[PDB]
Amino acid sequence: LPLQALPEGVDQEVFKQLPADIQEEILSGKSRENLK
Amino acid sequence: MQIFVKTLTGKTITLEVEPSDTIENVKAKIQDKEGIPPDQQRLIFAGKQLEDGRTLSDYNIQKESTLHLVLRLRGG
């Protein structure tokens, strides 16, 4: 999935590093992070 | 002895631990380094999430083994 539901500061090329039990934690929608 | 816990932002922090400084101890190593509480961290290794009821020895973690981390904002 693209930035279709990820935080407004994250990329799938740095979120696919997470288990399926955290895929659901970032696809939830967050802030205070900017992939930088 | 130390490890490298990389964040959800692709940056890593060097941290000193022991095979007995289990996850609830490690959360203080990351809190000390940035101020992030144990209630908002989310630590991973070899691609799985550790637990506060284990030990670094229960997951064979050693020096320079490299780990991963995610965080939250409590809600605001």
Domains of chain A, by residue range, sit at 1-36
Put simply, whether A32 touches B (Cβ < 8 Å) is: yes
Contacting residues of A for B68, CB less than 8 Å apart? 17-18
Q: Do the beta carbons of residue B74 and residue B38 sit within 8 Å?
A: no
Mutate to test the interface with A, among B8, B9, B67 (most CBs of A within 10 A): B8
Domain assignments of chain B as residue spans, ordered by start: 1-76
Structure tokens at B29: 């190593």
How determined?
A: NMR
- Bridge-partner residues for A12, per DSSP? none
Q: What pairing do the DSSP bridges indicate for beta strands B12-15 and B3-6?
A: antiparallel
Cα(B36)–Cα(B47) distance, integer angstroms: 21
Task: List, in sequence order, the alpha helices (H) in chain B.
Answer: 23-34
Domain boundaries B1-76, CATH class: alpha beta
Please tell me the number of Cα atoms within 13 Å of B54 on its side-chain side. Answer: 14
Q: Do the beta carbons of residue B49 and residue A22 sit within 8 Å?
A: yes
Cα(B16)–Cα(B3) distance, integer angstroms: 7
Cα(B59)–Cα(B39) distance, integer angstroms: 21
